[PDB]
Amino acid sequence: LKPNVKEIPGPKARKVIEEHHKYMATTTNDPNEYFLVIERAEGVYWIDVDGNVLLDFSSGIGVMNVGLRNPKVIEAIKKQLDLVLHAAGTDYYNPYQVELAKKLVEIAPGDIERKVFLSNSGTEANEAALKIAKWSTNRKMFIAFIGAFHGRTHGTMSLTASKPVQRSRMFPTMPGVVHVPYPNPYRNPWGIDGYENPDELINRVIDYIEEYLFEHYVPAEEVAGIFFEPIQGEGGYVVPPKNFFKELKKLADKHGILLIDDEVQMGMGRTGRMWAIEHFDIVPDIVTVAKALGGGIPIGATIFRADLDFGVSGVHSNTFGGNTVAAAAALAVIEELQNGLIENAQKLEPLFRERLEEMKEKYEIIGDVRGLGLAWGVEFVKDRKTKEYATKERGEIVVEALKRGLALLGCGKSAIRLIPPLIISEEEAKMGLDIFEEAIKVVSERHGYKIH
Amino acid sequence: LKPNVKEIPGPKARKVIEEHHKYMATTTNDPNEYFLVIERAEGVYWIDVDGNVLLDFSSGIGVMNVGLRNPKVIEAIKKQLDLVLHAAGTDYYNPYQVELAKKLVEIAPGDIERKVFLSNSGTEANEAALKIAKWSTNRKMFIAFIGAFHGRTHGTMSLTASKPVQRSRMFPTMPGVVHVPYPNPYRNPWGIDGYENPDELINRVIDYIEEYLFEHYVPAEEVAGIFFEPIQGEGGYVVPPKNFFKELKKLADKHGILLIDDEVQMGMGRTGRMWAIEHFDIVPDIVTVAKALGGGIPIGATIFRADLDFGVSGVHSNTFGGNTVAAAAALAVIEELQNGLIENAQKLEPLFRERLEEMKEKYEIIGDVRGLGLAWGVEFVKDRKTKEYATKERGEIVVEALKRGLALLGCGKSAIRLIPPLIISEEEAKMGLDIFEEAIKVVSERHGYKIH
Amino acid sequence: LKPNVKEIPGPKARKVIEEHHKYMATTTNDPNEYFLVIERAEGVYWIDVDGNVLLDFSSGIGVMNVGLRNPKVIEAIKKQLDLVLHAAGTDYYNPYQVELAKKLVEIAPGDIERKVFLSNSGTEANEAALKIAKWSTNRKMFIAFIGAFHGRTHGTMSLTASKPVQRSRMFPTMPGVVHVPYPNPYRNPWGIDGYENPDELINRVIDYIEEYLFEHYVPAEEVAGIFFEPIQGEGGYVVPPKNFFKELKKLADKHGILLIDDEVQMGMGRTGRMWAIEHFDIVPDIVTVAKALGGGIPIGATIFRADLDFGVSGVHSNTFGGNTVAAAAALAVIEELQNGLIENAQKLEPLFRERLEEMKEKYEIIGDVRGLGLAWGVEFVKDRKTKEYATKERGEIVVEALKRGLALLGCGKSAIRLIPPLIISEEEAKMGLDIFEEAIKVVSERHGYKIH
Amino acid sequence: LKPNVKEIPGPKARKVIEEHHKYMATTTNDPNEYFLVIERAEGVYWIDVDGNVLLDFSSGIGVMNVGLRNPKVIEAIKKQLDLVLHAAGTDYYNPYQVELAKKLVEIAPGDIERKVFLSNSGTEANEAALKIAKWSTNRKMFIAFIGAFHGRTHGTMSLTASKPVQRSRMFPTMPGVVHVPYPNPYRNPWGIDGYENPDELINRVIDYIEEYLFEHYVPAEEVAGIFFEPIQGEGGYVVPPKNFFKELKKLADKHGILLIDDEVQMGMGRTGRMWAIEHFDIVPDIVTVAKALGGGIPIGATIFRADLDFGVSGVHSNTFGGNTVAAAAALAVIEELQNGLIENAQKLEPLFRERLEEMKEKYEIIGDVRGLGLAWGVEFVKDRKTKEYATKERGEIVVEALKRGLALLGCGKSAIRLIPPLIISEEEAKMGLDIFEEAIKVVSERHGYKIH
Ligand SMILES: NCCC[C@H](N)C(=O)O
Ligand SMILES: NCCC[C@H](N)C(=O)O
Description:
Four copies of one chain form a homotetramer.
Chain A: H1 11-23, E1 38-42, E2 45-48, E3 53-56, H2 59-62, H3 71-81, H4 95-107, E4 114-119, H5 122-137, E5 141-145, H6 154-159, E6 177-180, H7 198-214, E7 223-228, H8 244-255, E8 258-262, E9 286-290, E10 300-305, H9 324-362, E11 366-372, E12 375-380, H10 391-403, E13 406-407, E14 409-411, E15 415-418, H11 426-447
Parallel strand pairs in A: 3-13, 5-6, 5-7, 7-8, 8-9
Antiparallel strand pairs in A: 1-2, 2-3, 4-10, 9-10, 11-12, 12-15, 14-15
The structure holds L-ornithine (2 copies).
One L-ornithine (ORN) sits between chains D (28, 61, 149, 152, 234, 265) and C (90-91, 317-319).
């Protein structure tokens, strides 16, 4: 298998897209920018319904970290199918869900007392985090960051602050969430270069919470939790300054506020550590995970300080939580990560840094590149001084990559995320970066952007 | 296989239960009333980790309708694992999710045009219903019924009114939900026998909404939706009067209010129709399903009138939605249902009605039996006049059934649900009802309840 | 002065009404049902701008208890205008507000220690009660009754459940209020005659709270307070059964819930006790008063158990609170009340009961008469069996009374309130009841209602 | 009368303070910083209960703009007392309330169609503004400014963002308010000197609303209104840049958002214009007023664009609104303002600017002085570089002014407001500024602050 694309979308792709439009609700599907219609998958490749072969830099939005069709994950699933699929994890007991909980407790950041609540998705895991924090602190308010993405349920829609269309006609959602600027080193209300001056940007974000919220309208004692992504995902693959979470933890600790680390996108080895928060040297009170945990099967986990546990039975539960097929898949995922995929993300890191810095030097349309491990963000701007979003052009780069056999996803208003499966070879990575560079070059030439 | 129980919980079960309490959050597991630790399943039987063999009358809380471990569903999953697992159904397209959406549209109640939003759970399917209703109507309030269960997320916790511990320290959840009494023919605020006088009970509930809410504090024009279970599940397997939903729909239509039918527990053939609402001759605007749809793989679906679609992209989305493995499972489930399992529910309905009415005649501790298809509730009371809940006795009956190789679940404060897989034979069903009756006899004799 | 009416509304009245509609917001003024344009007042009489003279049975919606224009109250105001008007009672101190606070503490129901928060209105007094209850209990939910009126501010609009137009497009107001049926002995969801069977109605309301709210969706421990009117005013002058509040207090005490008695309309001597709750033999935790307290100057007061005080400065405050002119007026009002006006209410109670029961015997259009002291409600119905509201007829009776020189107000959907100033003579009262009866006779004859 | 103070608090003052503490709720009274106990008032002087005479620079928190005891206001009141006090302004009509509404429509900023809703206080007037805006736009969200003060009711507590103690245990209040930094030229999150660079600070506040809120989590189309004070009062007498409201109006107009101008403290001539918004050259959609409007009698008004009017009767109302004593007082207040008090505020302005700039040059403890007309703020800091709040010292300056016969109020964390009645003479103003300078000098010497 190698990238090989003729007509896309082909006739079979166009037929499915038409049928999708007829029977399915309008969500985030784009017939003009995302015309990929997947039929099957092999190693790091998609094969679409017309036989087109595409190199995967999407991981299906950071879910297929261990590969598009991991054989070790599939064996575990088939083995679990011969035993039981659903055991009603929350009314009856089963050993598969308990074996996963024991492993998640062990691999949790830091070395503190942990328990786990299992669910079916990232948004469920964040909803469970909200409930654990409310119950354990008896506090009802939360702080979240502008640009955040935590899910689309009534609780998590209040935490999410990515695109206003996410909230259109939804008000009122869960009350009690206040938002403050993320320490985005490329775009922040202070105009601070947070790469050159990380401490200045850290102090402005901390000062905003302390002076602007705590000293005026948000009683610090009534805040249950601060929710954060350790790198903002949907918001643009935004990597905050290295010392930010240490300063955030000093502020939270002074007021008895929990730190809630959303690893739904950046966890499960994506940054060359089991958790992205590991690069920032703090131990969050709650960690939420989903997506890559189940290696393609729906699963969520909320890993929390043990003493936060619900005092009584029946405060939270679900039907599908502790799903044995999901539990089997996740145990197989974690062993793959620990046996070389995390190390492979650390090894590939400098290839991604070097090539993307080379692309920033050469192509003016690139405002910023940023990343850790195999989580990389490239933001496109009309002008490096105004930083006006190159949204049209970003979309065209994705489309040109597809035509050349590379599957990419946009993030934020004008960025692209590069998130290839952690099984990707050096040679597969170089090929995808070369195709990515060609798509930028094409759209740069087509719009007259400087090429140095 | 036959019901065969020695010590339960056995030594391997006790080890799992202790590990569960150590590593996992406190939810709805009960070491005292539900000490069932499942290792595998075969036909209508659980095999626990100590080799005990139990006849299943739980169906994993109404999820395993097509049997504890269906070969057609397993075959379809294995076939799907060969092609792909996750294709990012909400960014990219794939034919598998579209095939399921088309089928759900076709089997939806009534003959109006529909679309589908796919999710991972019942609570997600109901959160999507909230969002669809708010967007499409531009109204923000909802009516739900006392005793309802719709899920534990911030939006669905406001809809749910089953047990107050479900809300403990969670206020505020999503504002805007008002609750009114369910037309429960055994227990209602008016003292009405809703079996003997159904129209009187219907009329009291309808008049409570019109006279008490609409004419006093709830502007009818601001209500987006009325959420209902067609039989309350977690609330006690409560079957409302046959004409109630017709009268509810007249009131809703008068005010432009949507009807949202929660079929998460009563759907997928349980009541001897594909949808439980089909017994009540209305066409709801929105139908939610989960649990049984995936035959053991987590899935949810929100089926709605096509003109309620989100008019713009990015209002609602999910990661795992349109999961290809769940979709393959769901199409298999629907084929099995349409090709014989629903007919089986229809055939065994009279055996349950006959056996449960005989038990009610013989055992004074039984206050009420009610049901449709293979959905049966039996409610235990201390005295048939007071209808004082026999909560302790109900728990003792579940334990005595389990010791004798029958897995039952409680529902409401003093009821038991009988929900065996729809593949159950007449002989297997008779074996179950016999054990259930032996358990009732034992607990009656212990406490001095009359046996006629 | 005697009732004397020629044209109403006369030419000067019509000019004022037209100017009102041009310059002022649309509220609860009614050019068709309430065309009374007041120029001055003398004793128990309004003199309108065209010189019409009307006997007042309105008391300015229960504000002018001490008479339409009391000389002792006017003397005290004039004396206070000589010294000071506003002294900023919440930053600086003054002896006038303190003298009133001391008096209110002394005349509060029961013999427990109290403190007082002074405000400008009934809605302010009730918003202060919400804040006192939330702070002192650290709980956030409230129970209120269907038919209640507590004010139109964002906190009190959630408590109020009188007419849905009061809430139109205002959602969301303050979250956390659940409503249950009032023990209205004439109209209730159970169809109970609460006059003949008061304990049955009490028991249904108490059981609705315990069984339907506490045992299903409202955690009793999270309820800060139960708000009630001791007689519902705007809801129809509805007198609940004499033992209801005693049973309500048992339920509240069991759960640590405060009792908040809204006396804004029924206090200051109206019912022939200083507080209407004194008829029902309980000591509420919080009492709110306004309207009549100031004898025509805006004032409100929130009287509470001293141990509910805000433990810290700056939680609640106001500008005009402890206004010295209002305080001087209020002390005068309380002296007049204690020195004869409350005795007058006691003396005239039997004349109202006798005359209104005679009217109920004679006029079939009257469904119900109810009252205490000088607080009387008469409810008009199309048919004594259906109790269909005679809303049009009720409005016609108010208009026919006005044409004959009696000012009445509607209450609820088809009732009239009789609330004459407490200085009214037996002769003046008889003149009023005679005009009221003539108005009922006229509207009965017009529509063919039986006259026995 | 001249400032003459011996012992303060004297024995009679100490007795009232003790009694206040016994019978009245803990609010914003300070026995240690505000020991003034007012007995009567004359011209611009308080006389306390021990015969101490103090020059008034407080106006009783901006209420006594026309004087402590205006004779023209008192005559109007006594004249209205001979006619009627309360006419039930919202059920019946009266010419006094209509004459006030007609005058408020006329004096409203700009020349656009207006109507008026009358209430009893600033917080009621702001609550009415929230309801008018919600009803007229059918939008439920609001933007308010950090540092804002709009009242302590459930609606206005959401708008208020001055001290977190104002909200202690009150959550949840009315949902839907988002807060952004005020353009405070002395203290803002960008560290911008807004005196030297007003356009830079304006653009940062506008950009924060547009880029940070509108482009991320606050759909601009769902915002009913932006609430602002034209000078922040309780927050510190903060005067925004001259062009700020023109830029705010361009932003609001682009999205159909209302501008709601809170003049409860800065209106009724205080800044040498009838309204403070007049200095900023925009025409707000809604204007709220109270305090000084009633010249010492409780009153509120909400003046709004006529087409916003409530479409139906019964959405908003009150009992005491249109109170004829209040209406008479307010008509007399407005005539005093228009006949020379507003002009007197313009005349005294440069005396206040010159003396306070002289004090800033001389006393290092002064960080900032700012003001318009007779509204002036002096902010005290420990260090002019850190701007650390000199809260202890601010309180001591107030106390030393009192001992020397000047009544001052603190504002914000370390400011003092100078708000003398608009009837103050040049000679009275110089005397109060000389006493104010002596109090600063004393506390400067006492703490070692530089005196240049
Ligand atoms: N993982 C976050 C984004 C995934 C999905 N397309 C959504 O927008 O919900
Ligand atoms: N005018 C605003 C402040 C007035 C009062 N002391 C309060 O804090 O509420």
